[PDB]
Symmetry: C5
Subunit: 241 residues, 5 copies
């Protein structure tokens, strides 16, 4: 069994973000098969109720290299693979090419833990998202250079302490999730955000762009994917027409 | 209501620039459907009269990677997405792939404000385009490095006063708009220009090329998109034949 | 005569990794010919029983630029070429495009030999892979800068003693092979790994990212290819439906 | 009214270089339709007699990303666009994709003028190409870094005095033209050469690679395009069979 | 009249390497029109007996961006262009795309000449290949940065003497030819090697990776193309099934 509330909260959970782009011969799939496409994803998601957690986002109209993207969470990478492999046999699956994939895994806190930084940690755990259900999702893969990794844990802590300080306040505004990827894919992290206030999201990044940590990014985006939040079937219904 | 005068002047407005390139199988769409294309787009813009402001520009013949491109203003990002999504269902939308998308948001003045640089700010707001209606649009994404962002807001202000000084002069010549994107897309800024004097515009960029601020750019173009200003139906009427 | 146990163990063995991505018109091959494509690969591999050693891995659903990939080991690169060349004339072969090829050769120990680093040689050669038959494969090309190659062998040795130290604890966890490539292809090394514990593997790579040697990487990934271990016939069966 | 010798000599002239690549489906336009492609171009050039000056060069067999490319000179970038747009409606235009476009504008001398550098300006102005009519063309876009641009006019002049010293000699061999692009496209300059001696031309670039100015180049080719000079109809005749 | 022993030995000789990749619809050419395509290439080469020297190498199975590549040598670049242009009119030619082209020209010795470096120059000319017919070809484009070219010829000579000292030994083992490209394409040099011993050749690159000269390379491969030597008619016969 796989419960949303738990799997998104736990360490050892594999995140698989996959960005698809619809090929032009999709508008030539017969309106009938295309309308029936949504139910098919919905049943596929149900059929794996117990193997993976599925999220699906709409980026068509906001992104060059994707029309929609999935966020799979799984206790087992192989199972996230099997879902995706089966998704690609779907009617929509057979009509979209993959433009991005990011594999990461969840871990315990490395810096702002109860032990190491109790002060900021109390802040982080007891802060609570306010106001409107988030209409937008942002996914940003982030990779830091060899210099970063070769600083001592004390120095890296200091800098993550600096990361946390202006950002804790945006927790009323923005939901966050951090996956780890070094060794597993071509990035060090995958970050995932949901927010209703894009102006606030901009200011949040500017905050972080402005601290020493930013000096070690060799990837911070590329792509920065920002699309819009819906139910799996709605995304597909919107792709259809 | 979305008044062109107001929406282009206020903060918190989203710009979505989208560069499209026609596929070769557009020449094989029946000269009939193709000529009906312009009206279809015109009608679409009318339907969305009240959700977004639409601009369309012709780059075919001047750009490797776009035949035409839209500028969308919205108070709601989701609404820009809806329009664009509906554009790509159109006859022309169906025969063009996306080659670039930039999402950005309008903000208040950060440096050359009434508070921070009163002298320059006055020259700025009391400067006024003179002469022939501009025929040319240039759009330029700009990203600055971590080192810039790690400068003190005092240091960056001084640099931006340096940016404003030799450029005020070109406000009779060149119209400008600034969008902010850090965290929203793969750029710090989206800059937008209308001019009738390209040689002037060349001198303008050289001016800015020669100051310290330039030292921090990691993207300043790529693509630099210069195309030609027309009414939306006219852009589509030119892609017809 | 080619025994798996010997050829994977010996110096002067050529490795050729080739990532394939299936074209969309494979979904349009008659489902009958697609199911028959597995036996075909299986018979070809029997055909070169004595020419090459063949492994094949499933990356569909986990990788943007491959659905599958081969590892060929041969005593003679020409025989590797024939094999690969004959595969591409196979039914699946005719429906996939090559997206990456790494050519490499197996060499004797340059650094952590018994002569040069006795103590760590002992460690490495004594503790053995325990733990479950590995489900995951990882393939990482690595290339170091000219600064590295210009350091004295005495300096590079010290650096590789520092690489070795943290890895010793993953000897029960992770299986490794190293091919050499400088001058034969666009990388210095091809690294190959098999594991069942991806979190462990992530930890390993973090340990490596954090030593001085990481300072010299100009390539360490791109792509980092991670996918799944199965019998060649099973991989092609997996691609069929 | 547009005389070749005038427009190639004057400031304020727009250059539009466009490198085209024929698609496979051109070898399947019937020979007959393909051979009538040459007159269609020839007739388009005569049609635009008074709007633009057209040059066409053969690159097939010599360049990966072009079979041919145009050089258009205009007093009006808008008129370059129109011509280009109309060429792309041509039989040949319908079977080729654009792969590079460079926009630029002619200016007066910045450095080696009569005022600033009288000695060298004399030497430049009073020198004239000798011997066999040039068979080869080379087009090379150049971009210098923020550091170049932040040097003083005095420092930059010294460096261009350095550029000009070893190159004057090659004016007996090589014809040149200098377009300016900063802010108009993704390059600072577009340089244009005609020669019959490629070994000379090679010695010319090495002369230039060897000086300080070459230290600030961030683009200096890419693509370096070398092809062969013919009348416009002769270029389309060649591409036909 | 073009003699292989002579043209490969003389200065002022144009080299034009071109890497081609067969398109998927080549498997749909009726086998036999395919096998008969070798005859066509053979005839084209004899038709150009007097114009160019032709070589053909098989890379299918070992390279991502080529199935085969040509080496053309000519006294007149134009004639190489005609040859190539006429090859692409060929049956195979109509089914392949070009993925790479390098143009360059033979020159007299710059560094290791009797006058400048008398001893090594003697060692060079009086060195003679033993061992089997080479099976392998490698083609490596090399570009050095502005810092190299800004070194005085004294300093560069020293460095080329350093390149040449550990490499002479490999002349019994490996065959080399050096072409010059600065200004003619997007590389400083094209290097061409024929060997039968690939472990040797790896060791040869590492020798050269480890000298100061390597510090100045900005391109040294990309692509490193290693393929398999045969007669022209044999390479096409091979591409056929
Ligand atoms: C505004 C809400 C945010 C908060 C409260 C926040 C807080 C944190 C905290 C507490 C950590 C340390 C976790 C640990 O070590 O266990 C962390 C790490 C990290 N954060 Fe954020 N962050 C926020 C926004 C962002 C944004 C906008 C980004 C940009 C993409 C980002 C990217 C990252 C990355 C890549 C790491 C891992 C750093 C490392 O590997 O050492 N965060 N963040
Ligand atoms: C010639 C007329 C121009 C004038 C009067 C002008 C003025 C200004 C001013 C006053 C600001 C600061 C606004 C603020 O922070 O609130 C600014 C910002 C900016 N300008 Fe311009 N500018 C001009 C042309 C250009 C050009 C040609 C470019 C090149 C694309 C450019 C790029 C930018 C960028 C990227 C910013 C944001 C800088 C930052 O993030 O701190 N401007 N400009
Ligand atoms: C975890 C188990 C590992 C062990 C026991 C191990 C051990 C070693 C040893 C002993 C050598 C020296 C061999 C020689 O000089 O002959 C070596 C070289 C090398 N290793 Fe690993 N390593 C491990 C994991 C990794 C990982 C995760 C990577 C990164 C992908 C890696 C990359 C490399 C590379 C690129 C070289 C060649 C270094 C050079 O050229 O000088 N190893 N390794
Ligand atoms: C031997 C023939 C050449 C001569 C006589 C020559 C001369 C000059 C002169 C006099 C200038 C300054 C013009 C001015 O500032 O008003 C100049 C500028 C320039 N040249 Fe050449 N040049 C030659 C060949 C080349 C070559 C092979 C290149 C390489 C592509 C090149 C690239 C450029 C560029 C990019 C500029 C503008 C520099 C700047 O913006 O400050 N030139 N050349
Ligand atoms: C082992 C056999 C080799 C020998 C005997 C050899 C010898 C030489 C000599 C004598 C020169 C200078 C010739 C002149 O200046 O006119 C030269 C230049 C050069 N070699 Fe080699 N070489 C060998 C292998 C290689 C290899 C493996 C490479 C790697 C790609 C290479 C790359 C180059 C390049 C790029 C140059 C031109 C340097 C420059 O432009 O100034 N050589 N070689
Ligand atoms: O720490 N936010 O991924
Ligand atoms: O700051 N001009 O967008
Ligand atoms: O470094 N083991 O590939
Ligand atoms: O400066 N030669 O274009
Ligand atoms: O110097 N070998 O090309
Ligand atoms: Ca984006
Ligand atoms: Ca290669
Ligand atoms: Ca990957
Ligand atoms: Ca442009
Ligand atoms: Ca070229």
């Amino acid at each position: 069994k796989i419960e949303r509330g738990t799997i998104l909260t736990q360490p050892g959970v594999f995140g698989v973000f996959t960005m698809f782009k619809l090929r032009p011969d999709w508008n030539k799939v017969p309106v009938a098969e295309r309308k029936g496409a949504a139910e098919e994803v919905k049943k596929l998601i149900e059929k794996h109720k117990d193997n993976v957690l599925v999220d699906l986002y709409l980026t068509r109209g906001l992104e060059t290299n994707s029309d929609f993207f999935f966020r799979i969470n799984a206790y087992d990478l192989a199972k996230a693979q099997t879902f995706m492999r089966e998704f690609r046999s779907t009617t929509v699956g057979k009509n979209a090419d993959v433009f991005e994939t990011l594999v990461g895994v969840t871990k315990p806190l490395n810096y702002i833990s109860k032990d190491k930084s109790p002060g900021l940690n109390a802040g982080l755990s007891s802060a609570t998202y306010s106001g409107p259900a988030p209409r937008y999702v942002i996914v940003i893969p982030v990779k830091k250079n060899a210099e970063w990794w070769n600083m001592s844990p004390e120095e890296r802590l200091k800098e993550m302490e600096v990361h946390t300080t202006p950002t804790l306040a945006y927790l009323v505004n923005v939901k966050r999730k951090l996956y780890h990827s070094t060794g597993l894919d071509d990035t060090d992290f995958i970050t995932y955000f949901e927010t209703d206030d894009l102006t606030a999201f901009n200011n949040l990044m500017l905050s972080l762009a402005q601290v020493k940590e930013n000096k070690f990014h060799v990837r911070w985006g590329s792509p920065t994917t920002l699309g819009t939040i819906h139910s799996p079937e709605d995304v597909i219904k919107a792709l259809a027409d």
